[PDB]
Design an enzyme around this catalytic site. Sequence first.
Site, PDB file in Angstrom:
ATOM      1  N   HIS B 225       0.794  -1.225   0.000  1.00 12.45           N
ATOM      2  CA  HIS B 225       0.000   0.000   0.000  1.00 12.45           C
ATOM      3  C   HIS B 225       0.836   1.289   0.000  1.00 12.45           C
ATOM      4  N   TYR B 229       1.567   5.720  -2.213  1.00 15.89           N
ATOM      5  CA  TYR B 229       1.683   7.074  -1.631  1.00 15.89           C
ATOM      6  C   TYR B 229       3.108   7.599  -1.814  1.00 15.89           C
ATOM      7  N   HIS B 376      -9.140   1.862 -11.876  1.00 15.50           N
ATOM      8  CA  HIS B 376      -8.820   2.708 -10.700  1.00 15.50           C
ATOM      9  C   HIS B 376      -7.411   3.217 -10.798  1.00 15.50           C
ATOM     10  N   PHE B 377      -6.438   2.326 -10.897  1.00 15.15           N
ATOM     11  CA  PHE B 377      -5.070   2.768 -10.646  1.00 15.15           C
ATOM     12  C   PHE B 377      -4.393   3.484 -11.807  1.00 15.15           C
ATOM     13  N   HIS B 378      -4.877   3.331 -13.042  1.00 14.89           N
ATOM     14  CA  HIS B 378      -4.328   4.114 -14.173  1.00 14.89           C
ATOM     15  C   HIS B 378      -4.751   5.583 -14.057  1.00 14.89           C
ATOM     16  N   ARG B 441      -8.860  -9.096 -14.440  1.00 13.94           N
ATOM     17  CA  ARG B 441      -7.561  -8.513 -14.717  1.00 13.94           C
ATOM     18  C   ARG B 441      -6.549  -9.628 -14.988  1.00 13.94           C
ATOM     19  N   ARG B 442      -5.378  -9.232 -15.478  1.00 16.33           N
ATOM     20  CA  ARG B 442      -4.216 -10.104 -15.666  1.00 16.33           C
ATOM     21  C   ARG B 442      -4.461 -11.293 -16.606  1.00 16.33           C
TER      22      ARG B 442
HETATM   23  C1  HAS Z   1      -0.584   6.562  -6.970  1.00 21.86           C
HETATM   24  C2  HAS Z   1      -1.257   5.436  -6.992  1.00 21.86           C
HETATM   25  C3  HAS Z   1      -2.490   5.194  -6.201  1.00 21.86           C
HETATM   26  C4  HAS Z   1      -3.246   6.079  -5.320  1.00 21.86           C
HETATM   27  C5  HAS Z   1      -3.051   7.539  -5.028  1.00 21.86           C
HETATM   28  C6  HAS Z   1      -4.302   5.162  -4.824  1.00 21.86           C
HETATM   29  C7  HAS Z   1      -5.392   5.613  -3.933  1.00 21.86           C
HETATM   30  C8  HAS Z   1      -6.316   4.805  -3.173  1.00 21.86           C
HETATM   31  N1  HAS Z   1      -6.508   3.520  -3.438  1.00 21.86           N
HETATM   32 FE1  HAS Z   1      -5.482   2.299  -4.796  1.00 21.86          FE
HETATM   33  N2  HAS Z   1      -6.584   0.663  -4.185  1.00 21.86           N
HETATM   34  C9  HAS Z   1      -7.287   0.595  -3.031  1.00 21.86           C
HETATM   35  C10 HAS Z   1      -7.755   1.767  -2.262  1.00 21.86           C
HETATM   36  C11 HAS Z   1      -7.328   3.143  -2.439  1.00 21.86           C
HETATM   37  C12 HAS Z   1      -7.859   4.215  -1.562  1.00 21.86           C
HETATM   38  C13 HAS Z   1      -8.849   4.143  -0.413  1.00 21.86           C
HETATM   39  C14 HAS Z   1      -7.157   5.392  -2.085  1.00 21.86           C
HETATM   40  C15 HAS Z   1      -7.259   6.778  -1.586  1.00 21.86           C
HETATM   41  O1  HAS Z   1      -5.964   7.232  -1.184  1.00 21.86           O
HETATM   42  C16 HAS Z   1      -7.864   7.699  -2.659  1.00 21.86           C
HETATM   43  C17 HAS Z   1      -8.306   9.060  -2.092  1.00 21.86           C
HETATM   44  C18 HAS Z   1      -8.491  10.073  -3.224  1.00 21.86           C
HETATM   45  C19 HAS Z   1      -9.449  11.018  -3.288  1.00 21.86           C
HETATM   46  C20 HAS Z   1     -10.494  11.212  -2.209  1.00 21.86           C
HETATM   47  C21 HAS Z   1      -9.501  11.927  -4.498  1.00 21.86           C
HETATM   48  C22 HAS Z   1      -9.169  13.382  -4.155  1.00 21.86           C
HETATM   49  C23 HAS Z   1      -9.374  14.221  -5.394  1.00 21.86           C
HETATM   50  C24 HAS Z   1      -8.553  15.214  -5.776  1.00 21.86           C
HETATM   51  C25 HAS Z   1      -7.325  15.579  -4.996  1.00 21.86           C
HETATM   52  C26 HAS Z   1      -8.865  15.974  -7.046  1.00 21.86           C
HETATM   53  C27 HAS Z   1      -9.298  17.420  -6.859  1.00 21.86           C
HETATM   54  C28 HAS Z   1      -9.255  18.090  -8.228  1.00 21.86           C
HETATM   55  C29 HAS Z   1      -8.870  19.385  -8.434  1.00 21.86           C
HETATM   56  C30 HAS Z   1      -8.433  20.266  -7.298  1.00 21.86           C
HETATM   57  C31 HAS Z   1      -8.816  19.947  -9.847  1.00 21.86           C
HETATM   58  C32 HAS Z   1      -9.714  21.148 -10.020  1.00 21.86           C
HETATM   59  C33 HAS Z   1      -9.233  21.959 -11.198  1.00 21.86           C
HETATM   60  C34 HAS Z   1     -10.061  22.517 -12.087  1.00 21.86           C
HETATM   61  C35 HAS Z   1      -9.444  23.281 -13.215  1.00 21.86           C
HETATM   62  C36 HAS Z   1     -11.553  22.359 -11.993  1.00 21.86           C
HETATM   63  C37 HAS Z   1      -7.760  -0.762  -2.739  1.00 21.86           C
HETATM   64  C38 HAS Z   1      -8.597  -1.232  -1.628  1.00 21.86           C
HETATM   65  O2  HAS Z   1      -8.675  -0.514  -0.643  1.00 21.86           O
HETATM   66  C39 HAS Z   1      -7.149  -1.617  -3.724  1.00 21.86           C
HETATM   67  C40 HAS Z   1      -7.286  -3.111  -3.829  1.00 21.86           C
HETATM   68  C41 HAS Z   1      -8.476  -3.504  -4.661  1.00 21.86           C
HETATM   69  C42 HAS Z   1      -8.440  -4.967  -5.031  1.00 21.86           C
HETATM   70  O3  HAS Z   1      -9.461  -5.636  -4.829  1.00 21.86           O
HETATM   71  O4  HAS Z   1      -7.402  -5.453  -5.524  1.00 21.86           O
HETATM   72  C43 HAS Z   1      -6.369  -0.628  -4.495  1.00 21.86           C
HETATM   73  C44 HAS Z   1      -5.534  -1.038  -5.606  1.00 21.86           C
HETATM   74  C45 HAS Z   1      -4.499  -0.250  -6.235  1.00 21.86           C
HETATM   75  C46 HAS Z   1      -3.470  -0.891  -7.082  1.00 21.86           C
HETATM   76  C47 HAS Z   1      -3.338  -2.295  -7.547  1.00 21.86           C
HETATM   77  C48 HAS Z   1      -2.467  -3.146  -6.674  1.00 21.86           C
HETATM   78  C49 HAS Z   1      -2.457  -4.501  -7.359  1.00 21.86           C
HETATM   79  O5  HAS Z   1      -1.724  -4.679  -8.357  1.00 21.86           O
HETATM   80  O6  HAS Z   1      -3.194  -5.421  -6.931  1.00 21.86           O
HETATM   81  C50 HAS Z   1      -2.626   0.226  -7.442  1.00 21.86           C
HETATM   82  C51 HAS Z   1      -1.418   0.199  -8.322  1.00 21.86           C
HETATM   83  C52 HAS Z   1      -3.259   1.363  -6.727  1.00 21.86           C
HETATM   84  C53 HAS Z   1      -2.687   2.714  -6.800  1.00 21.86           C
HETATM   85  C54 HAS Z   1      -3.154   3.897  -6.067  1.00 21.86           C
HETATM   86  N3  HAS Z   1      -4.303   3.929  -5.366  1.00 21.86           N
HETATM   87  N4  HAS Z   1      -4.407   1.084  -6.103  1.00 21.86           N
HETATM   88  C1  HEM Z   2       0.160   4.076 -22.757  1.00 23.64           C
HETATM   89  C2  HEM Z   2       0.025   3.958 -21.455  1.00 23.64           C
HETATM   90  C3  HEM Z   2      -0.610   2.800 -20.833  1.00 23.64           C
HETATM   91  C4  HEM Z   2      -1.534   1.902 -21.275  1.00 23.64           C
HETATM   92  C5  HEM Z   2      -2.277   1.951 -22.609  1.00 23.64           C
HETATM   93  C6  HEM Z   2      -1.696   0.936 -20.228  1.00 23.64           C
HETATM   94  C7  HEM Z   2      -2.539  -0.199 -20.277  1.00 23.64           C
HETATM   95  C8  HEM Z   2      -2.590  -1.208 -19.305  1.00 23.64           C
HETATM   96  C9  HEM Z   2      -3.552  -2.256 -19.264  1.00 23.64           C
HETATM   97  C10 HEM Z   2      -4.633  -2.456 -20.298  1.00 23.64           C
HETATM   98  C11 HEM Z   2      -3.307  -3.029 -18.150  1.00 23.64           C
HETATM   99  C12 HEM Z   2      -4.077  -4.236 -17.690  1.00 23.64           C
HETATM  100  C13 HEM Z   2      -3.628  -5.511 -18.324  1.00 23.64           C
HETATM  101  C14 HEM Z   2      -4.047  -6.751 -17.566  1.00 23.64           C
HETATM  102  O1  HEM Z   2      -4.617  -6.756 -16.450  1.00 23.64           O
HETATM  103  O2  HEM Z   2      -3.802  -7.850 -18.125  1.00 23.64           O
HETATM  104  C15 HEM Z   2      -2.182  -2.465 -17.504  1.00 23.64           C
HETATM  105  C16 HEM Z   2      -1.652  -2.924 -16.313  1.00 23.64           C
HETATM  106  C17 HEM Z   2      -0.861  -2.101 -15.536  1.00 23.64           C
HETATM  107  N1  HEM Z   2      -0.400  -0.859 -15.853  1.00 23.64           N
HETATM  108 FE1  HEM Z   2      -0.632   0.136 -17.467  1.00 23.64          FE
HETATM  109  N2  HEM Z   2      -0.876   1.240 -19.234  1.00 23.64           N
HETATM  110  C18 HEM Z   2      -0.194   2.346 -19.513  1.00 23.64           C
HETATM  111  C19 HEM Z   2       0.734   3.043 -18.739  1.00 23.64           C
HETATM  112  C20 HEM Z   2       1.043   2.772 -17.420  1.00 23.64           C
HETATM  113  C21 HEM Z   2       1.841   3.578 -16.569  1.00 23.64           C
HETATM  114  C22 HEM Z   2       2.512   4.885 -16.915  1.00 23.64           C
HETATM  115  C23 HEM Z   2       1.870   2.937 -15.360  1.00 23.64           C
HETATM  116  C24 HEM Z   2       2.561   3.339 -14.119  1.00 23.64           C
HETATM  117  C25 HEM Z   2       3.259   4.459 -13.947  1.00 23.64           C
HETATM  118  C26 HEM Z   2       1.106   1.738 -15.499  1.00 23.64           C
HETATM  119  C27 HEM Z   2       0.968   0.778 -14.540  1.00 23.64           C
HETATM  120  C28 HEM Z   2       0.310  -0.440 -14.749  1.00 23.64           C
HETATM  121  C29 HEM Z   2       0.291  -1.483 -13.701  1.00 23.64           C
HETATM  122  C30 HEM Z   2       0.908  -1.402 -12.332  1.00 23.64           C
HETATM  123  C31 HEM Z   2      -0.451  -2.513 -14.166  1.00 23.64           C
HETATM  124  C32 HEM Z   2      -0.751  -3.795 -13.428  1.00 23.64           C
HETATM  125  C33 HEM Z   2       0.267  -4.909 -13.775  1.00 23.64           C
HETATM  126  C34 HEM Z   2      -0.092  -6.271 -13.198  1.00 23.64           C
HETATM  127  O3  HEM Z   2      -1.289  -6.519 -12.925  1.00 23.64           O
HETATM  128  O4  HEM Z   2       0.811  -7.154 -12.948  1.00 23.64           O
HETATM  129  N3  HEM Z   2       0.618   1.662 -16.760  1.00 23.64           N
HETATM  130  N4  HEM Z   2      -1.794  -1.322 -18.194  1.00 23.64           N
HETATM  131 CU   LIG Z   3      -3.505  -0.103  -1.106  1.00 25.53          CU
END
Ligand code: HAS
Ligand code: HEM
Ligand SMILES: [Cu+2]
EC number: 7.1.1.9
Lengths: 31, 554, 167
Positions: B225, B229, B376-378, B441-442
């Site tokens: 996790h 962050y 979610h994570f993209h 996935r995967r």
């Molecule tokens: C950098 C990467 C990531 C962040 C950040 C992230 C945030 C969260 N995630 Fe996550 N996620 C999970 C829960 C959360 C929760 C509660 C948050 C929170 O931290 C998110 C809070 C975010 C917000 C409340 C949004 C705030 C909005 C903002 C800040 C935008 C404001 C916009 C403005 C100001 C623009 C305005 C401008 C104008 C011009 C209008 C959970 C479960 O609880 C799983 C497992 C699910 C499963 O079944 O496998 C999970 C799975 C993943 C995996 C897959 C791991 C794997 O391979 O199995 C990745 C890579 C990942 C990345 C990230 N995730 N997440």
């Molecule tokens: C052109 C840009 C991208 C495309 C079109 C793309 C597309 C994809 C797709 C379709 C999957 C899911 C495949 C599967 O579950 O079999 C995947 C997995 C993933 N992508 Fe991307 N992706 C891009 C860029 C990125 C970047 C920039 C990051 C991170 C900085 C990222 C991180 C991941 C990760 C962590 C997974 C999961 C790998 C795994 O399950 O083992 N991707 N991507």
């Molecule tokens: Cu997590």
Amino acid sequence: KPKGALAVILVLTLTILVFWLGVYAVFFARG
Amino acid sequence: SRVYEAYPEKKATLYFLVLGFLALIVGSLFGPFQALNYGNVDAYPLLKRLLPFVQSYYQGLTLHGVLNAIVFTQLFAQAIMVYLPARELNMRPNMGLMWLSWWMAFIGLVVAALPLLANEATVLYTFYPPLKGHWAFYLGASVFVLSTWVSIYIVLDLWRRWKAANPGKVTPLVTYMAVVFWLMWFLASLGLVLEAVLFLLPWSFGLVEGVDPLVARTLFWWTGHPIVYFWLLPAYAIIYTILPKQAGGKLVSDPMARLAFLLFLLLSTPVGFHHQFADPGIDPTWKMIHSVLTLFVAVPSLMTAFTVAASLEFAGRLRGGRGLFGWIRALPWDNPAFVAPVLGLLGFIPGGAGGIVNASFTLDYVVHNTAWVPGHFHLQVASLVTLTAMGSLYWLLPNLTGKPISDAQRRLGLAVVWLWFLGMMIMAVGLHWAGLLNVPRRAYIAQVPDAYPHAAVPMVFNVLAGIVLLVALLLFIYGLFSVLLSRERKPELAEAPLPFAEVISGPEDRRLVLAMDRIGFWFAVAAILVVLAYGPTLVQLFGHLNPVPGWRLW
Amino acid sequence: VDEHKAHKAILAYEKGWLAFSLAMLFVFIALIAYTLATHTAGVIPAGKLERVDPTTVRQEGPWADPAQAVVQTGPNQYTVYVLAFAFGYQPNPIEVPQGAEIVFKITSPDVIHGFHVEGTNINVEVLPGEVSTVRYTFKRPGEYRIICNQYCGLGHQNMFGTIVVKE
Ligand code: HAS
Ligand code: HEM
Ligand SMILES: [Cu+2]
Ligand SMILES: CCCCCCCC/C=C\CCCCCCCC(=O)OC[C@H](O)CO
Ligand code: CUA
């Protein structure tokens, strides 16, 4: 007062609720 | 140049940055082909002609995950969270150590990469036993990651030296951000380091016969996790302390920025059972506790949303925008440095919403291990974090090299950023919607073309996203190498200061800052929370180890 | 002044936003807590550690004869011993009556697999050396597909099974 910032956090809140309640409903449909 | 004699930290930073982007490019090559796959189009016969070392979809997937999510993001973190505090304090970091960190990173990468390229570690970026990779993969990954412990030392050294010269003064804002960032990472990193040292390495060398997969996953997700962050917080640092100047305004609150980072120190590590809701052998009570703590780790980003939106509204009004929405039009939408993270932030709204669903214990059974999760994570790392890194080509790179950005390169940059953002949004719809239809996935789904007929419509979105992101990647490659290989230099650009934002201040702010500056205390609290959240379950699992034999199924 | 009045007003609204946020998060906790007190919580895996030897599980014990894997353990309760392996499920099909509580006990003799029953909340990881126990009651008769949703090698995308729920 920061009306613009409030509009942004309104949009965020609606997104969170639509996601969460929509998935809560799917969970009960499959349970 | 005589600029690197005065500021050698510019050259080391540049090496981190370039290595990181090369990793992003090579890993991203596989993305479009994976997107087409999730559209039921099989383009892998063509990819194998171009890259004959690729033996399968899943090997391509391992390279994609490792190079983009572990390598690029770490190297960006190491560049940003060392160089920015150094420039704010105007002090030189220990250059011996800084070069040592780069060489560890580079050697570990090369060592890990070889078995990946030779089809000897097709185990994905999570490398879950008992699927058994080559030893060089685990050895290389371990040395690559440990490189960060040297970065932690370098920033704590800078912070201490500054405090010795400025007793009774509060830590400057960017340096406060980096210190709590790197201390968080130390605690976070222990899960993986323990997994590698006690289990993966002795096992891959032949010293033990099996590994317990449940204890391996548990130690993994301790690190797994807080690593996300770790990826995020460098972009946040830029979004808080640099983006407001670029927008034409100021950061509306120092203390609120500090508080968000502080909450990340406390709450980023003790939550990893949210990745284990579907695991046997972990008590439901503990799953609920981790679920509750995961909802609290959402607060600092909820906080971030308001503080940053209010900062951008303030800039918008200073540039003459009136009403509910006129502040938006007045922002500098012609600067790619401003545009990239802002688009990132927009996509982070749906991205974060999906995160909160995932955290909610029993709701995770709807979406676990489906296409929803990569959806979610993209939005989080492949959009906000990556786009923020892309925007820094336009201010950070000239500050390091002296090479100016031409007006044509600016315009190209705006196109890349918009196409990347739009591509991610389109894919997000396809993956979220496919996930709700139970597509896993995967999975090389294109090789079973009749298995998920109900998902024909979301598959069209995935094909489209595939080709849009192919075009964006190609334009990016071209743009990066135009800037780097360009002949023209201007040393006055390399000696200019970084565009740090000013802050609006209130009488309230100093009392809050002092309490937050007691970093020893706050670090101790974060360590104790990890022990309470993890200790009882690990004692139970280590008591009842059941190691099992390894398998190679590729 | 302009900027000080902005700092004051921004912060005033931010305190409201923060209080609202906490309130919303607490409501989600209550709504989750509610699901843990209903029948739908049966899909949470048992937290008890139940060790087995993955090398002998096809030779001895409840997984060795898939034709005797469905066992009446209660008046309206059946226990099913399921093997998830490279690359299939046994028994195939799994046959069970509608309206009965079904206790699934799932293990693997090789690597980690998923067990995701399309149309239900059953979605559990299956680890070698360990038994995953989940409970569900099927309301509608018919065929339900089992999908392996954890990467388990090159046969992963073709690893499916079947449950038949009889009227
Ligand atoms: C950098 C990467 C990531 C962040 C950040 C992230 C945030 C969260 N995630 Fe996550 N996620 C999970 C829960 C959360 C929760 C509660 C948050 C929170 O931290 C998110 C809070 C975010 C917000 C409340 C949004 C705030 C909005 C903002 C800040 C935008 C404001 C916009 C403005 C100001 C623009 C305005 C401008 C104008 C011009 C209008 C959970 C479960 O609880 C799983 C497992 C699910 C499963 O079944 O496998 C999970 C799975 C993943 C995996 C897959 C791991 C794997 O391979 O199995 C990745 C890579 C990942 C990345 C990230 N995730 N997440
Ligand atoms: C052109 C840009 C991208 C495309 C079109 C793309 C597309 C994809 C797709 C379709 C999957 C899911 C495949 C599967 O579950 O079999 C995947 C997995 C993933 N992508 Fe991307 N992706 C891009 C860029 C990125 C970047 C920039 C990051 C991170 C900085 C990222 C991180 C991941 C990760 C962590 C997974 C999961 C790998 C795994 O399950 O083992 N991707 N991507
Ligand atoms: Cu997590
Ligand atoms: C300012 C106002 C102050 C008061 C604000 C209070 C907010 C209460 C929120 C949620 C209530 C929880 C509802 C719990 C009942 C859920 C029942 C349900 O969802 O039923 C689905 C299914 O049919 C069953 O198996
Ligand atoms: Cu079994 Cu994937």
